[PDB]
Amino acid sequence: GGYVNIKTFTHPAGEGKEVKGMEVSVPFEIYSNEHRIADAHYQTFPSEKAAYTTVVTDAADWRTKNAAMFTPTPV
């Protein structure tokens, strides 16, 4: 039950490239069903209510947001 409140941190990822940080609240069951942790640049805290403005709605939404944590983008 409740939410996993994930904040990831903006950081360089190759010259001219970066990964932007995000703050997302994910229902714990969606999170525990499938997550990928490949970056150390994040923190998590749990809560009964979503602490962040961006709230994951379903598994597909989370898959998308989780992937945006590992995809380098041009600065």
The CATH number covering residue 8 comes to 3.90.930.20
Nearest to 59 by CA among 27, 35, 30: 30
Task: Give the separation between CA 4 and CA 50, rounded to whole angstroms.
Answer: 8
Helices and strands counted in the chain (H then E): 2, 7
- The experimental method, as deposited, was X-ray
Residue 42: domain span:
1-75
Number of separate domains in the chain = 1
Task: Give the separation between CA 50 and CA 28, rounded to whole angstroms.
Answer: 11
Neighbours of 35 (CB within 10 A): 14
Resolution of the entry in angstroms? 1.9
